[PDB]
Design a protein around this ligand. Structure first.
Ligand SMILES: *[C@@H](CC(=O)OCC)[C@H](C[C@@H]1CCNC1=O)NC(=O)[C@H](Cc1ccccc1)NC(=O)[C@H](N)Cc1ccccc1
Ligand SMILES: *[C@@H](CC(=O)OCC)[C@H](C[C@@H]1CCNC1=O)NC(=O)[C@H](Cc1ccccc1)NC(=O)[C@H](N)Cc1ccccc1
Lengths: 304, 302
């Protein structure tokens, strides 16, 4: 038993991390086969960032102006192109550690692992959720751009996030690996704000099932409610509306525990209206919303 | 900015994980050079659990009683011995992915990453702390024994933990890689109870510094205290006493924030006496004690 904030094993991604330097700017890239993917703002300087002319900046560059190092060992760039907000550097060496992979766009409320990297060197791995306002509450410092988020589906690494920037509120924004931002953000330094964040209801329910599976049942009573009546309470506490599709994906956790989804909804309603009364749930005194139903199943069933 | 429960990258350890089968019992092993390490209770069955006579069980086995697989390649066993509660299986092929490593025995309050594994295949990684009562609050299912805990010191993997068992309280116990249990526990299915758990004070203070670095600052008060007076408060709330070495270890965070450790102690005193009054710190409504001062520096300096 037990429940931790668990990330995917990072080995397959570690072997893809490189550093990309353009003049005085260095950030991280993702080296897959004979291409390195990185944020295009690596070609910028301070004079550029309000309205970078990325096409102008790139055409002034030769393959020789890009310095790519894999473990501080240089790779030769033989081509360069731009796809949306990502630079694609073609190198003369294919990465022999490239895993089976896919580029995927994740949905708000879904989770992924982030391999935080600096100067092409992995520093740590943690779990993040894509917030309903299309930011992530990550942990990133100067030099972290180009760090990626990923899930492992079977034996395939599904890359879903490349890091670009931190908003003044301390939250983070980035792109998919095709270079399209999540949310209403741009890679120019205009004043940018994320929408109001909401709590991911289906994940809170998943985590309450995780608590039941682990024997932490004090919040459970033989109560139940309707989906409409639950959602009336949810919106009073800035929780996302729970749809029948959310109910369905909680099926496996309901099946394991024998607690109907709307019974757990009734328990959650009671927690929101009356509080937790100084009690903890799986070691937390707040309601946690960055575990998906699949996250709980994986950790409560040990998939490899 | 930001602050997360962050583990070490697990790649160097992933390449060391194998599956060990004895009879119909399968768990995980650690393959370094030409030795596979795993919990010795792999050689047990239902009968032996009360008081396994491990020496009898092991001497009666042959090399052929052990099936070791790295992925789907079989590693032929050429010897089998016991070191404390760990089985050492000598195999014919040395692990080509053996990292620079050390076996280290860590102290209570220190943190490490756990690569949770099943049938020799990694499932996930998370961060744990050695509790003062020498248990860990991990996440382990049946088949997870032999999973290891580690820290990374640049290029060197320091293995500190191998998973053996779960106490009925939901917490976990295991050994170092020399086979010696942390705490008073034994690998027998006997009524075993963990001593009273306490809160790791130096880690709470490190996390409060992480909060200040991240802009959470409402809990700061202008008072300073002394180490003796603070420790009287620690004792009341089942916090570990704070030593001068702890204070000095917090020095890098005090230097980054300009807040003296004993000033942060006075802020923690008020938090412990009166709670947080509906406010949060780094997204938590509890005082978090599984980040060491180093974990905060490493994450807040990169
Ligand atoms: C990554 C940049 C990098 O690694 O290369 C230089 C060494 C860095 C990551 C943030 C720095 C601190 N922690 C972070 O996550 N990104 C930036 O510094 C970013 C550059 C940028 C990206 C897109 C558009 C304009 C500038 N600048 C920022 O994050 C600043 N907070 C400014 C900012 C930019 C856009 C929206 C809001 C604020
Ligand atoms: C690991 C064993 C394994 O991999 O199986 C081989 C086929 C497993 C991990 C616990 C199971 C569920 N989650 C866990 O962390 N360990 C056991 O099952 C363990 C076996 C054992 C080890 C030493 C001494 C006796 C039995 N049994 C237990 O953990 C039970 N909770 C019984 C128990 C043992 C010791 C103290 C308190 C309870």
């Amino acid at each position: 038993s037990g429940f931790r904030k668990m990330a995917f094993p990072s080995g397959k991604v570690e072997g893809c991390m490189v550093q990309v330097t353009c003049g005085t700017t260095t950030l991280n890239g993702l080296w897959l086969d004979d291409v390195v993917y990185c944020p295009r703002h690596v070609i910028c300087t301070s004079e550029d960032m309000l309205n970078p002319n990325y096409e102008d900046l790139l055409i002034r560059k030769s393959n020789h102006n890009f310095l790519v190092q894999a473990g501080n060992v240089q790779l030769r760039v033989i081509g360069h192109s731009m796809q949306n907000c990502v630079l694609k550097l073609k190198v003369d060496t294919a990465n022999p550690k490239t895993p089976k992979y896919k580029f995927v766009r994740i949905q708000p409320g879904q989770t992924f692992s982030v391999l935080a990297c600096y100067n092409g060197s992995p520093s740590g791995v943690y779990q993040c959720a894509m917030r309903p306002n299309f930011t992530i509450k990550g942990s990133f410092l100067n030099g972290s751009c180009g760090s990626v988020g990923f899930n492992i589906d079977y034996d395939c690494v599904s890359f879903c996030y490349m890091h670009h920037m931190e908003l003044p509120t301390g939250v983070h924004a980035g792109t998919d690996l095709e270079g399209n931002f999540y949310g209403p953000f741009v890679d120019r330094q205009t004043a940018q704000a994320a929408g109001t964040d909401t709590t991911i209801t289906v994940n809170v329910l998943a985590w309450l099932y995780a608590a039941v599976i682990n024997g932490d049942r004090w919040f459970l009573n033989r109560f139940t409610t309707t989906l409409n009546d639950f959602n009336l309470v949810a919106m009073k506490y800035n929780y996302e509306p729970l749809t029948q599709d959310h109910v369905d994906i909680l099926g496996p956790l309901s099946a394991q525990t024998g607690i109907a989804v709307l019974d757990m909804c009734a328990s959650l309603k009671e927690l929101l209206q009356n509080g937790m009364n100084g009690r903890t749930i799986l070691g937390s005194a707040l309601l946690e919303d960055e575990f998906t139903p699949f996250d709980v199943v994986r950790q409560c069933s040990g998939v490899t």
